Amino acid sequence: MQNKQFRNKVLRVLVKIYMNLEKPDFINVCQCLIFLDDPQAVSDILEKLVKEDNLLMAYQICFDLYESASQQFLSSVIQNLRTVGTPEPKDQTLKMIKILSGEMAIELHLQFLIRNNNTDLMILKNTKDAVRNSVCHTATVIANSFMHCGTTSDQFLRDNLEWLARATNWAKFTATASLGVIHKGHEKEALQLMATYLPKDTSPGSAYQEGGGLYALGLIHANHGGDIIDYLLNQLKNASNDIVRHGGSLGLGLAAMGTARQDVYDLLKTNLYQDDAVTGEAAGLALGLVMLGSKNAQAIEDMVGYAQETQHEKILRGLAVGIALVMYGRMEEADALIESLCRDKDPILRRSGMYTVAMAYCGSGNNKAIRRLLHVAVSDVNDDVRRAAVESLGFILFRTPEQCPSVVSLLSESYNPHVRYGAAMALGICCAGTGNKEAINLLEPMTNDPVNYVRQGALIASALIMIQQTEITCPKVNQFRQLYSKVINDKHDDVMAKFGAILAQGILDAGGHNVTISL
Amino acid sequence: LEEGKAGSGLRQYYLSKIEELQLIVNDKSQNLRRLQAQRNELNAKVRLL
Amino acid sequence: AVDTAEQVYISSLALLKMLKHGRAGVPMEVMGLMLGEFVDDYTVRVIDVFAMPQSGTGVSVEAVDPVFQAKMLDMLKQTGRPEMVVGWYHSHPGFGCWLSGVDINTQQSFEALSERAVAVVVDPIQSVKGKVVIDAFRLINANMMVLGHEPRQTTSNLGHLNKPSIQALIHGLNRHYYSITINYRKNELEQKMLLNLHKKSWMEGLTLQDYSEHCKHNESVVKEMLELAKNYNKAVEEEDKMTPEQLAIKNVGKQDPKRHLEEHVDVLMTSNIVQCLAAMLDTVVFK
Amino acid sequence: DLYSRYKKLQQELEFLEVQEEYIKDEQKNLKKEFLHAQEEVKRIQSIPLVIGQ
Amino acid sequence: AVQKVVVHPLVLLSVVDHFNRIGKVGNQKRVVGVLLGSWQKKVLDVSNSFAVPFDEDDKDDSVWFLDHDYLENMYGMFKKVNARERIVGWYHTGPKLHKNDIAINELMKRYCPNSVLVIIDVKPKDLGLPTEAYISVEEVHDDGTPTSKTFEHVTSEIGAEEAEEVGVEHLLRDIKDTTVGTLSQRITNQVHGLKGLNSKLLDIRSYLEKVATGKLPINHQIIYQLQDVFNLLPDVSLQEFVKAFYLKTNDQMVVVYLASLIRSVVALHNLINNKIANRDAEKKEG
Numbered sequence A: 001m002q003n004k005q006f007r008n009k010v011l012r013v014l015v016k017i018y019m020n021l022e023k024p025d026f027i028n029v030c031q032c033l034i035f036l037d038d039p040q041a042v043s044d045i046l047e048k049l050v051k052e053d054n055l056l057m058a059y060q061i062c063f064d065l066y067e068s069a070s071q072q073f074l075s076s077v078i079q080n081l082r083t084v085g086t087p088e089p090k091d092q093t094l095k096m097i098k099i100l101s102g103e104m105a106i107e108l109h110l111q112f113l114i115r116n117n118n119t120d121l122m123i124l125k126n127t128k129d130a131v132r133n134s135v136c137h138t139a140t141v142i143a144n145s146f147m148h149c150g151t152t153s154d155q156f157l158r159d160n161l162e163w164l165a166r167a168t169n170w171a172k173f174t175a176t177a178s179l180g181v182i183h184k185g186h187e188k189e190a191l192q193l194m195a196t197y198l199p200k201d202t203s204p205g206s207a208y209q210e211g212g213g214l215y216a217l218g219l220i221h222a223n224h225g226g227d228i229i230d231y232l233l234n235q236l237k238n239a240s241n242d243i244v245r246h247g248g249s250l251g252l253g254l255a256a257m258g259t260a261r262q263d264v265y266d267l268l269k270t271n272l273y274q275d276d277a278v279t280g281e282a283a284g285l286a287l288g289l290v291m292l293g294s295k296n297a298q299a300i301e302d303m304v305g306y307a308q309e310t311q312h313e314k315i316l317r318g319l320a321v322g323i324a325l326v327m328y329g330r331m332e333e334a335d336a337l338i339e340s341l342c343r344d345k346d347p348i349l350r351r352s353g354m355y356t357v358a359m360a361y362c363g364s365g366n367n368k369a370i371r372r373l374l375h376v377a378v379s380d381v382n383d384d385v386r387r388a389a390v391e392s393l394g395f396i397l398f399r400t401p402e403q404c405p406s407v408v409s410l411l412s413e414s415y416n417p418h419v420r421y422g423a424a425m426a427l428g429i430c431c432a433g434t435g436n437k438e439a440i441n442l443l444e445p446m447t448n449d450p451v452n453y454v455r456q457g458a459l460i461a462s463a464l465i466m467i468q469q470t471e472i473t474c475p476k477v478n479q480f481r482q483l484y485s486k487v488i489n490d491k492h493d494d495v496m497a498k499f500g501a502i503l504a505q506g507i508l509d510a511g512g513h514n515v516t517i518s519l
Numbered sequence B: 001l002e003e004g005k006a007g008s009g010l011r012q013y014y015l016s017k018i019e020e021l022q023l024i025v026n027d028k029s030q031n032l033r034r035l036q037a038q039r040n041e042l043n044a045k046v047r048l049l
Numbered sequence C: 001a002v003d004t005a006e007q008v009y010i011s012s013l014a015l016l017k018m019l020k021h022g023r024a025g026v027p028m029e030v031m032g033l034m035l036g037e038f039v040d041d042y043t044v045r046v047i048d049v050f051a052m053p054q055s056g057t058g059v060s061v062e063a064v065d066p067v068f069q070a071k072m073l074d075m076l077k078q079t080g081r082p083e084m085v086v087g088w089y090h091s092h093p094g095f096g097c098w099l100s101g102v103d104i105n106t107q108q109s110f111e112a113l114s115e116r117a118v119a120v121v122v123d124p125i126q127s128v129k130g131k132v133v134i135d136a137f138r139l140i141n142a143n144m145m146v147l148g149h150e151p152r153q154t155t156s157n158l159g160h161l162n163k164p165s166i167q168a169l170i171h172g173l174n175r176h177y178y179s180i181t182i183n184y185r186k187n188e189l190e191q192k193m194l195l196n197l198h199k200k201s202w203m204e205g206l207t208l209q210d211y212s213e214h215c216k217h218n219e220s221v222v223k224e225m226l227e228l229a230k231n232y233n234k235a236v237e238e239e240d241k242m243t244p245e246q247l248a249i250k251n252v253g254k255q256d257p258k259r260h261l262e263e264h265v266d267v268l269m270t271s272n273i274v275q276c277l278a279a280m281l282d283t284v285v286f287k
Numbered sequence D: 001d002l003y004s005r006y007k008k009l010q011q012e013l014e015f016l017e018v019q020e021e022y023i024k025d026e027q028k029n030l031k032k033e034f035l036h037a038q039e040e041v042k043r044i045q046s047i048p049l050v051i052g053q
Numbered sequence E: 001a002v003q004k005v006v007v008h009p010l011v012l013l014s015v016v017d018h019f020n021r022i023g024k025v026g027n028q029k030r031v032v033g034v035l036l037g038s039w040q041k042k043v044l045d046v047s048n049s050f051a052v053p054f055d056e057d058d059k060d061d062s063v064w065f066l067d068h069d070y071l072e073n074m075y076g077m078f079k080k081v082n083a084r085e086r087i088v089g090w091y092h093t094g095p096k097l098h099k100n101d102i103a104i105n106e107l108m109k110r111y112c113p114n115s116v117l118v119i120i121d122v123k124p125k126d127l128g129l130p131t132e133a134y135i136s137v138e139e140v141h142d143d144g145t146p147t148s149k150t151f152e153h154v155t156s157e158i159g160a161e162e163a164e165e166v167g168v169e170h171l172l173r174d175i176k177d178t179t180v181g182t183l184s185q186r187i188t189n190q191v192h193g194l195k196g197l198n199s200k201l202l203d204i205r206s207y208l209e210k211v212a213t214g215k216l217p218i219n220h221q222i223i224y225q226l227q228d229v230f231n232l233l234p235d236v237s238l239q240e241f242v243k244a245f246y247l248k249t250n251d252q253m254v255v256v257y258l259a260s261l262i263r264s265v266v267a268l269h270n271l272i273n274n275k276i277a278n279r280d281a282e283k284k285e286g
């Protein structure tokens, strides 16, 4: 549990030993460059690739450094490597060009993930048997987006058109967004596929198709290098009501995540200056994404100054996530900011302090914030910070899966159902991708209670653990059978309990058991 | 030598006594959280009332 | 054909006006009008709420005097109340908070101007003083019977809307008659003014007056409560003399619902007033 | 592994030590809620009532 | 005539509305509201109230603007909907008593009966009770000064009859009830010294300032009773009260025996179940 005051020096002095040896190792330069993130520690290894004249060894370090461990440090190292070389000349050019591409991973993932799919008629037929026209209509298409993610399988949605556009509401927006979750990584078939739906009059009666086209396009071009953002500014400049603003703000902000461009900041501010709660919520969600690591001076004070001067709540949660996601790596900085903003009279901003401190203290590097996290989880009378409290606890304690259920086992069966639900989200996020049974043996008391909240979060938390698990290792028959009885027992259950039930069933079937999640 | 087995040996034994203090804090957390489950179950019971 | 997820904002103004109007909520039918401002589609805020004079006819469209309504509204317009009417409220004592045919007819007639037409029915007559849970009512379109009833998004708050779970009125008359969620709002001026006002409402004038009253009543009046307290203590100890026989015979199962412990703990808490006020007398005697 | 158990175990020392003031907060707050709900269900019992058999 | 009054928090929350419907104009002066109540009984009971547009002048203090038609129309309609409450007086939100208040109150002294005056604070930072009932009666002065309107302080209490307690308790969900015992007693016994410290310390500084730097007679006659009552406790030698300390300390001994003995009775079930449960669960576990 280092404080980063000496770890970076110990690493930057222990990386000088392998360069003097007979051969350089990759595990130490990776495990150091994932923490120190210093430009002076990469300028040597990026220029030694030409001196060593070894092509095969650079592909691994380039693949994983360009893969993860940085976004803006990659945005700087791409031009640092762009400056090196010509403004073996013929080989270094194709090397430097082909290493920063990053689309080869999308091609191979699209290839094996295009030839490894496994679909069954029992799941989708069961969804059509349990589908309702009001609530779970979005659950069926979000589960279909989960199972058909990456495989671009629109043939399931090509069966009939009377099951999707039968109701003019947000269900079509979630259907087109779910379509954006189905296919991803397409520079021509995406925009062409969206334009081919109604290229007749250029006037859709339902704007949710256009808003879902912009939001879905932002889902497709997430973190891509061939962004169409330049065209998305001329398309967002068009005057439209709550669909180009909302869907265009979400898609444009997601596509411009990490760029820290002042242009999207300006047009985003003039997009939120209309005092509307929905386009301001999307403006906050986009501003938090695009401001990753920027830490603008007047932006935080402008948002917190914009918070208390309005009565809407969606603007307060949108700016809450907006000022929450912007805070990354400010452990030594946001102490007075979060400590000062913790005593605010607004419960929404009180949740924004914990959501903000969640990503700031990732890595279990601060045992102090938990004092006020659990202290406001138990002491405060409003259930908003109580159910929104322990998400930061799981986000900081995601390292150890065993230590979480020992301290959240009391929160499994808490006083109010809100701490039970937020604690269910905590068990869902802390034990995800692992095999710890300390939450699984506690899932049985969570799944039976007169309150539908703890049942919904219990089915979601149970759905986040059973993924990527074999039956011969652990007896999962209990939660498989009790999870399968919810879609047949939906007649005697609540309307939202079946929503979270089939929505929880779409988690295991996501991608046909091929794709998973990792923290 | 005679340090890792003797000096670090008594340091490890002192670490075992620290594990005894963490067993007092441990079982204090256990019985305090079980009594916490009793009060939570009673106040939750009158909440069911 | 479009619907959103609306939520009615309720401040302490309309709440306390519905509490005084509930004190004046005689069995006779009463009338009221809610005011506010419409900022967007899916939010509604009430600020101004007043009462209406009673009539022998009761709740009806004929009882609403347009020259009196528009007169009082104009007198609110010449003052610092630039808010238009947002709905009308009333009381339904005894027979439940549901709406009769006359109420849905005057609601249908009064909803021609405002598309929202918030309706609230307060009934503090049979409601206990423990909870003041109130519910807002809505009118559904008669042409929506073919399509879904309520295509309202954000189905999370319906769990909070499931608190009025009476098995006769909500789903006993839920056809063509639904409801909407209710939330509150409180700024720092109401929080500190009303909080310090209630703490002061439970405190003294100078806050030092009634302390010595009990500090010196411990020697005059509380002595009787201490002797009687010891009479209950001994009155339980006379059975606690018999307890070690049963506890010395069976030791299996519990048959007496009395605990004999927490009551004596409470007796000790009432007995600690002498200890806590002894230092108070030490301060009054000292300085 | 042998000498790493000390400093690795210190993280468990802090993780178990941080629960002290937490369980203090729960045991001091949940009884205040216990008397809140206790007096709330106590004040429901009112003197004006009907007598049956 | 009137010994005490009863003021409901509804009118003070209507002052919260006075601070809400301002509109951010920059005036925030002493907006005068028409106080309503029940003058029939000897005790005064405020149920609700309303306001009237009131504006003064910047330089000249003697400028005051009221309305008779608005008062007779709001009072006429309010009496038509509820005839159990009538006009009693008024109240201003200003923290300072200006000279023009005799002319402002004089209108409701002529047209209305004897009006009570209530001075409150625009900012709820004062720890003391915000409501002070000031009766508008003329008193004869001993020094020979001409008879003028005098504002005598009448004690006030903030209580709710049936519903406002429930509404306030539901809207707060943070305040606690009486709850006799450890916490509600020890909090008063901790913060009471500040509750008297801010009052006395806040008063005797400006008092001592106006002692030497004072003119325009402030009724120095009452200062003799002030220092007289202050000198009515001349540091008693505590000689006679020793036996009283033996009595209160003997009651302390009674609380000692009750605590030790009763807790010793409570130790029975714990110090028995700790053995009979652990040894039987242990011997029967395997």
Ligand SMILES: [Zn+2]
Pocket: C095
């Ligand atoms: Zn009736």
